[PDB]
Amino acid sequence: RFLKVKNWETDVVLTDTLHLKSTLETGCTEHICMGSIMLPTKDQLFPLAKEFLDQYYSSIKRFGSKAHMDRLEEVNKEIESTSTYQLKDTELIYGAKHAWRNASRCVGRIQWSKLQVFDARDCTTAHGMFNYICNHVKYATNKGNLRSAITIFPQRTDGKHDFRVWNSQLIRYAGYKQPDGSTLGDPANVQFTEICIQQGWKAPRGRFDVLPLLLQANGNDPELFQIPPELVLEVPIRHPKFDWFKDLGLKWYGLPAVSNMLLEIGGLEFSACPFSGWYMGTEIGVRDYCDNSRYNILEEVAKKMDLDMRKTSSLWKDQALVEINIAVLYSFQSDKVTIVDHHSATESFIKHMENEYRCRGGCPADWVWIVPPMSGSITPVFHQEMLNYRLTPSFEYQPDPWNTHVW
Amino acid sequence: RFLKVKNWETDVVLTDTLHLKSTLETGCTEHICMGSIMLPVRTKDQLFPLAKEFLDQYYSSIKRFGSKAHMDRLEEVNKEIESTSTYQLKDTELIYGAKHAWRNASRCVGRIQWSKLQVFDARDCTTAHGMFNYICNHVKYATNKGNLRSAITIFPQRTDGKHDFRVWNSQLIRYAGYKQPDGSTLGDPANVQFTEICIQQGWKAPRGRFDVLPLLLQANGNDPELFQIPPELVLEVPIRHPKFDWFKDLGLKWYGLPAVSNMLLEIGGLEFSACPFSGWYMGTEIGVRDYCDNSRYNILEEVAKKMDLDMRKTSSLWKDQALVEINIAVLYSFQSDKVTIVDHHSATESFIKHMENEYRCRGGCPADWVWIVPPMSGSITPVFHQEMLNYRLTPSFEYQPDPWNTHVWKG
Ligand code: HEM
Ligand code: HEM
Ligand SMILES: Cc1cc(N)nc(C[C@@H]2CNC[C@@H]2OCCCCCc2ccccn2)c1
Ligand SMILES: Cc1cc(N)nc(C[C@@H]2CNC[C@@H]2OCCCCCc2ccccn2)c1
Ligand SMILES: C[C@H](O)[C@H](O)[C@H]1CNc2nc(N)[nH]c(=O)c2N1
Ligand SMILES: C[C@H](O)[C@H](O)[C@H]1CNc2nc(N)[nH]c(=O)c2N1
Ligand SMILES: [Zn+2]
Numbered sequence: 001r002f003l004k005v006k007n008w009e010t011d012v013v014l015t016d017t018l019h020l021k022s023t024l025e026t027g028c029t030e031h032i033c034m035g036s037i038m039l040p041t042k043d044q045l046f047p048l049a050k051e052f053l054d055q056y057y058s059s060i061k062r063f064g065s066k067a068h069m070d071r072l073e074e075v076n077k078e079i080e081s082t083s084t085y086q087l088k089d090t091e092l093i094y095g096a097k098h099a100w101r102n103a104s105r106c107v108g109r110i111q112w113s114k115l116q117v118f119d120a121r122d123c124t125t126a127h128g129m130f131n132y133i134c135n136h137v138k139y140a141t142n143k144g145n146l147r148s149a150i151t152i153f154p155q156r157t158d159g160k161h162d163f164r165v166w167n168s169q170l171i172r173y174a175g176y177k178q179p180d181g182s183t184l185g186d187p188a189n190v191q192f193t194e195i196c197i198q199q200g201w202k203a204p205r206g207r208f209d210v211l212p213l214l215l216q217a218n219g220n221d222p223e224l225f226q227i228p229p230e231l232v233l234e235v236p237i238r239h240p241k242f243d244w245f246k247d248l249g250l251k252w253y254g255l256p257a258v259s260n261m262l263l264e265i266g267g268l269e270f271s272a273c274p275f276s277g278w279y280m281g282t283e284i285g286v287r288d289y290c291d292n293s294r295y296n297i298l299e300e301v302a303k304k305m306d307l308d309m310r311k312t313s314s315l316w317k318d319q320a321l322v323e324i325n326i327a328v329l330y331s332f333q334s335d336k337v338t339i340v341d342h343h344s345a346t347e348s349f350i351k352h353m354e355n356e357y358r359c360r361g362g363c364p365a366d367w368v369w370i371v372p373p374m375s376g377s378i379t380p381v382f383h384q385e386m387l388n389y390r391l392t393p394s395f396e397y398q399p400d401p402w403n404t405h406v407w
Numbered sequence: 408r409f410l411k412v413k414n415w416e417t418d419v420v421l422t423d424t425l426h427l428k429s430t431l432e433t434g435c436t437e438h439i440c441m442g443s444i445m446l447p448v449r450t451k452d453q454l455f456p457l458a459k460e461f462l463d464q465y466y467s468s469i470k471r472f473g474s475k476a477h478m479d480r481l482e483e484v485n486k487e488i489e490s491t492s493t494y495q496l497k498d499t500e501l502i503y504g505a506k507h508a509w510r511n512a513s514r515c516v517g518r519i520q521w522s523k524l525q526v527f528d529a530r531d532c533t534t535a536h537g538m539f540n541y542i543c544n545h546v547k548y549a550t551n552k553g554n555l556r557s558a559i560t561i562f563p564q565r566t567d568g569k570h571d572f573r574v575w576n577s578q579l580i581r582y583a584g585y586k587q588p589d590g591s592t593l594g595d596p597a598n599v600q601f602t603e604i605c606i607q608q609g610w611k612a613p614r615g616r617f618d619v620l621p622l623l624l625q626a627n628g629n630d631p632e633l634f635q636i637p638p639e640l641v642l643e644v645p646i647r648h649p650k651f652d653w654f655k656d657l658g659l660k661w662y663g664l665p666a667v668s669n670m671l672l673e674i675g676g677l678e679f680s681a682c683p684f685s686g687w688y689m690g691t692e693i694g695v696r697d698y699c700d701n702s703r704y705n706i707l708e709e710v711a712k713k714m715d716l717d718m719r720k721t722s723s724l725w726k727d728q729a730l731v732e733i734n735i736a737v738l739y740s741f742q743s744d745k746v747t748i749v750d751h752h753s754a755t756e757s758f759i760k761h762m763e764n765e766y767r768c769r770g771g772c773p774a775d776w777v778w779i780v781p782p783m784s785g786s787i788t789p790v791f792h793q794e795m796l797n798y799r800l801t802p803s804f805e806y807q808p809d810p811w812n813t814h815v816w817k818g
Contacts, residue, residue: 008445009702019439028435028442032426033797035435035442036776038415281722286786293416298787312752313690313738318731318784322724329722343721367443368776373791375727377695377782378707388440 007350009383014354016387018362023051024390035388036368039397042083048267049075049085052393056094084157086121087265093117095265096150099393100275105369107345107381108277110352111148115275116140118151126215129153129163130225133213133274137170137231140276141255144233146338150275154218155268163272164401166214166222167192170257170274171232174209185209187293195402200224208234208251216272221407235335239327244304248297252284252328254337260400265393273395278338280345285325286373297324321374342372346379353384364389416792421763423796425771430460431799442797443777446806448568449676451488457676458484458494461802465503493566495530496674502526504674505559505682508802514778516754516790517686519761520557524684525549527560535624535632538562538572542579542622542683546640549685550664553642555747559684563627564677572681573810575623575631576601579666579683580641583618594618596702604811608633617643617660625681625810630817644744648736653713657706661693661737663746669809674802682804687747689754694734695782706733730783751781755788762793773798 003016027040034040050072057068071088078085087095101112116139120132132151140149153163168189175183175190183190185207193211197203201212201224210232216222233254239245257276262269290298298320302309305323307316332339340348349370356363365386376382410423434447441447449457459481466477480497487494496504510521525548529541541560549558562572584599586592592599594616602620606612610621610633619641625631642663648654666685671678698704707729711718714732716725741748749757758779765772774795785791 003439006445009700022438025437026435026440028433028437028440030432030436031429031798032410033433033435033440033442033775035440035797036793036795037412038794290787291416291792313742313750315731315735315738315750317752317787318734321784321787322727322731325727326724329724333722341722341724343726366440371785373786375730375783376780376785378699378726378730382782383700384443385445386443388442389438 003387005385005387007380007384009380012354014357014362016357016362018356018360018391019364019387019389022364022389022391024392024394026389035366042079045084045267046076046079048392049079052095052266053091055098056091059094084155084268085266087268089119092119092121092152092265095393096152096263096273099263099265099395100150102364102391102394104364104366104388104390107280107349107370107372108340109363110348110355111277114148116147116149118149120151120153121155123153123163124218126217126220126223126225129165129215129217129272130213133165133170133215134228134231136274136276137227137255137257140257141231141233144254144335144337146255146276146278148275148277150263150273152263152270153272155270161219162216162401163218164216164222165259165272165274166195166216166401167211168258168260170213170259170276171227171253171255172211173207174203174211176203176205186288186295191402196224207249210253216401216405221405222401233337235331235337237327237331238334239323240330242305242323242327245323245327248300248304250289250295250297250327252288254279254332256283260398261395262398263393263395271398275395278340279332280340280342280372281325281329281332282342282372282374285328286321289324289328290321325374342375342379346370346372346381350380350384353386362387364391410796412794412796414789414793416789419763421766423766423771425769425800426773426796426798429773429798429800431801431803433798442775448565449678451492454493454676455485455488457801458488461504461675462500464507465500468503493564493677496677498528501528501530501561501674504802505561505672505684507800508672508674508804509684511773511800511803513773513775513797513799516689516758516779516781517749518772519757520686523557525556525558527558529560529562530564532562532572533626535626535629535634538574538624538626538681539622539634542574542624543637543640545683545685546579546636546664546666549666550640550642553663553744553746555664555685555687557684557686559672559682561672561679562681564679569815570628571625571810572627573625573631574668574681574683575604575625575810576620577667577669577809579622579668579685580636580662580664581620582616582662583612583614583620585612585614595697595704600811605633616658619662625814628815630814631810642746644740644746646736646740647743648732649739651714651732651736654732654736657709657713659698659704659706659736661697663688663741665692669807670804671807672802672804680807687749688741689749689751689781690734690738690741691751691781691783694737695730698733698737699730734783751784751788755779755781755790759789759793762795771796773800 005014027034057063075085096117136151173186174193175186213225214222234251237250256279259274263273289295302316302320308314309316353363366388367386370381412421434441466472484494505526545560582595583602584595622634623631643660646659665688668683672682711725711729717723762772775797776795
C-alpha cells in the first residue's frame with residue numbers, strides 16, 4: 001500500500017503515498033506487465049466533478065469551507081439540469097497545470113506551474129480556432145525565448161460536436177511517397193499530407209514543407225489554414241566543428257506543440273487543447289533525424305565523417321548519432337532558441353521528483369519514456385526507480401479524427 | 408485470450424498466448440506499474456503441483472506427454488515427495504530445466520543462444536573444496552582460451568534452508584574495491600562490502616585497482632571458505648583504442664568471463680541456491696556500466712580530459728562523446744585478443760530475431776524492455792521500438808538476498 005523507490009546510484013529511497021489516489025488503470029496485471037506498450041452520462045460525472053473540486057479547494061487551503069460546499073452544490077445543480085457544467089477560470093488553470101503535473105511520460109515537469117493558459121472556450125468556428133492558434137504560436141515562440149502555453153477550446157458535449165485539431169503537432173513537416181518508392185520529407189506524415197491535398201492544399205512537394213492546420217470546430221468538417229510563415233521559427237542545422245554539416249540541408253522548427261491530446265478535468269473532456277513547451281535536443285537529433293522510419297540520416301552523416309561502416313562493432317552509428325545531436329544543440333543555442341540537453345533535463349527531473357515526493361507524496365513517472373533515447377545510463381534517471389500510475393486531471397491520447405469523423 | 412505487441416519501426420504485430428502459462432506475480436497491478444523497480448523450505452502441499460507442472464512441460468517437449476514413461480515418472484516423484492519430502496531430478500530433466508530457466512529469463516538479451524548451454528551437474532558436491540574444484544573446471548571450460556562457451560554448474564538443491572550451498576561472490580570473477588580513509592575508492596566501488604568480508608576472512612589483499620577477488624564458498628550451510636582462482640584460469644583483456652594511443656595509459660583492463668553466481672535456479676519446485684552460470688559479454692556491460700557509471704570506475708571525466716573535449720557545458724555532449732570512444736576501445740580490445748564479445752547492435756538485432764521465432768514456435772517471449780534496451784544509443788537499436796510483454800515463467804532464475812545478511816555463523 002505504501003511503496004518505496006530507490007535510486008541505485010545515490011541510495012536515496014523515497015516513499016510513495018500519492019499512488020493511492022490513482023483512479024484509472026495501467027494496463028498491467030499481477031500476471032503481466034505492459035510497461036512498454038505505447039497504447040495499453042450525468043451519473044458518472046458528479047463523482048468526477050466532486051473529486052476534482054475537493055482537490056482544488058484543498059490546494060487553496062479552503063477545504064470544507066462554506067465557499068467549497070457552495071461550489072459543490074452549484075455544480076451538482078448544474079449537472080442535474082444541463083447534463084454538464086462549466087469550470088471557473090481559476091479551476092481551468094489549476095486543471096491544466098495539474099494535467100501537466102500528472103503527465104507521467106513528461107521529463108519537463110519541473111516547469112509545470114509556469115504554464116500560460118489561454119481560455120478559448122468562447123470559440124465557435126474554425127477561423128476562430130486558427131486565430132487562437134496563431135496567437136498561441138506567437139506567444140509561445142516569443143522570438144526564440146520560448147514560453148510554455150496551452151490553448152483550451154470548448155469541452156465535449158454529446159460528442160457529435162467535438163473540437164479537434166487534426167494535426168498531431170501544430171508545426172510538422174509534410175511527407176510524400178515518390179514514384180522512386182522512397183519518401184520525400186517526413187515519413188511520419190504521409191497519411192496526413194494526403195488528407196491535406198485531398199482537402200485542397202497546394203503542396204510545394206519539398207523536404208521541409210510546414211503542414212497547414214486542419215481545424216475542426218463544433219463537429220464540422222475540418223478546414224485548411226496556413227500558419228503565417230513569419231510565426232514559424234525554424235533553425236538551420238550546422239555543426240561547430242564540421243563545415244560540411246550545413247550542406248545536408250537540415251533544419252527543424254523551434255516550437256514543439258502537441259495538438260492531438262485530450263485534456264480531462266473534473267470529468268469534462270477538452271478534445272482540442274494544443275500545448276507547447278520547448279525541445280529536449282534528443283527529440284530532434286535522435287528521434288526525428290535518426291529513427292529508421294523518420295528522416296533516417298545516420299548513413300549519410302557517417303559517410304561524410306568517413307567512418308568504417310563495414311561492421312557494426314566500429315560503432316559508426318553511435319559516433320554519428322552523437323555528432324548529429326551536438327549539431328542540433330549548437331544550432332538552437334547559436335540562434336537563441338530555447339533548447340535543453342538530455343543531461344540538463346534529466347538532472348532537473350530528478351530534482352523535480354524529489355520536490356514532488358517531499359511536497360506531494362510522489363510523482364508518477366514512466367521510466368520507458370523518461371530515460372532519453374541515447375546515453376541512457378549516463379543520465380541520472382536511468383538509475384532512478386519510478387512508479388507509474390494515472391492521476392487526473394490528465395492528458396490522454398485519442399484516436400486520429402479521420403478514422404472517426406463522418407464527412 | 409490473446410495479447411498483441413507492435414513494433415513501431417516495422418509495424419510487425421505479434422500475438423502472445425504464452426502469458427497464459429504464467430504463474431508468479433509481476434509486482435504490477437491494474438493501478439500501478441512497477442516495471443522499473445529492480446526487486447518488485449516448501450511444504451509437500453505446494454511441491455507436487457510444481458513438480459507435476461514441470462514434468463508435464465518436460466514430457467510434452469520430448470513428445471511423450473501421457474506416455475507410460477511420463478505417468479511412471481509422475482508416480483515415482485509423487486512417492487518420493489510423500490516418503491522423503493522432496494525429490495531428485497533426472498540428469499535429462501536438470502538439463503532441460505537449466506536451459507528453460509535461461510529461455511525464460513526476461514531480462515536477458517542473449518537468449519538466442521539458450522539451447523546451447525553446457526550443464527555441469529555438481530549435485531554430488533559436499534564441501535567447499537569440492538565447490539572450488541567444480542568452479543575452476545567451469546571457468547576453464549567456459550573460457551576455452553577466449554572462444555567463450557556458455558555454461559552452468561548446479562550444486563545440490565535446498566533441503567531445509569539450513570544447509571544451503573551458496574557462492575557468496577555475486578560473479579565468479581570480479582575486482583576488489585577498497586574504501587580509503589579520505590573517502591575515495593581504489594578499484595571497484597561495487598565490491599567494497601564483499602572485499603571487506605574477504606579481508607576479514609583472511610584474504611591478503613594486494614590493494615590495487617584490479618585485484619581479482621577470491622571465491623568465498625559455502626557448502627551444506629557451513630561457514631564459507633576462501634579460495635583463490637588460479638590466475639592462469641582468469642583471462643583478462645588490456646583495454647586500448649584503435650586510433651587513440653594514450654588510451655592504454657589509463658591502465659584499464661577487464662576480465663573476459665561474465666559469470667553470475669548469486670542467483671537461485673528454480674526447477675519443478677526445487678531450489679538450487681548455487682548455480683553459477685556464464686556466457687560472454689555485450690560490450691556496453693563493460694564500456695557503459697562497469698567503466699562509466701558514477702558509482703563504478705567512473706572514467707568519463709578522465710577520458711574526456713585526455714580527448715580535450717569542451718567540458719564546461721553538458722550541451723557539448725562531452726560525456727556522450729567520451730562514452731562512445733570507451734565502448735569502441737572495449738570492443739576493439741576484445742576482438743584483437745580474440746576473446747568473444749558482442750556489440751549492442753548485433754546483440755539486439757539477434758534478440759529481435761529470437762523473439763519473433765519464439766512468438767511463432769512458442770506463442771511468446773517474455774521480455775523486460777527496461778533491461779533489454781542497451782544503456783547507450785537506445786533508440787538506434789531495434790529493441791527500443793519493440794513493444795514487449797513481461798511475465799514470469801518457470802523454470803526460472805531469481806534474485807536472492809546476499810548471504811552475509813542471512814547466514815547463521817557456526818564459528
Ligand atoms: C517546457 C518544456 C518541456 C519539455 C523539455 C518537455 C519534455 C518532454 C519530452 C522529451 C517528452 C517525450 C517526447 C517524445 O519522446 O515524444 C514529453 C512528453 C510529454 N509531455 Fe512534456 N515537456 C515540456 C513541456 C510540456 C508541457 C507544457 C506539457 C503540457 C502542458 C507537456 C506534457 C507532456 C505530455 C502529455 C507528454 C506525453 C506525450 C505523448 O504521450 O505523446 N510537456 N515531454
Ligand atoms: C551467451 C551470451 C550472453 C549474453 C551476451 C547475455 C547478455 C545479457 C545482458 C547484457 C544482461 C543484462 C546484464 C546487466 O545489465 O547487468 C543479461 C542478463 C541476464 N542473463 Fe544473459 N547473456 C548471455 C548468457 C546468459 C546465460 C548463459 C544465462 C543463464 C544460463 C543468462 C541468464 C541471464 C539472467 C538470469 C539475466 C538477469 C540477471 C539479473 O537479474 O541480475 N544469460 N544477459
Ligand atoms: C502511439 C502514440 C502514443 C502516444 N501517447 N504518443 C505518440 C506520439 C509519439 C510519441 N513520441 C514521439 C511522438 O510524439 C512526438 C510529439 C512529442 C513532443 C513532446 C514534447 C512536448 C513538449 C516539449 C517537448 N516535447 C504516439
Ligand atoms: C538489485 C539487483 C537485482 C537483480 N536482479 N540483479 C542485480 C545485479 C545487477 C544487474 N545489472 C548489473 C548487476 O549485474 C551484473 C551482472 C550481470 C551480467 C549478466 C550477463 C550474463 C552473461 C553474459 C553477459 N552478461 C541487482
Ligand atoms: C515500444 C516502446 O514503448 C516505444 O518505442 C517507446 C519507448 N520510449 C519512448 N520514449 C519517449 N520519450 N518517446 C517515445 O516515443 C518512446 N517510444
Ligand atoms: C531503476 C532501473 O530499473 C535500473 O537502473 C535498471 C534499468 N535498466 C537496466 N538494464 C540492465 N541491462 N541492467 C541494469 O542493471 C539495469 N538497471
Ligand atoms: Zn507494469
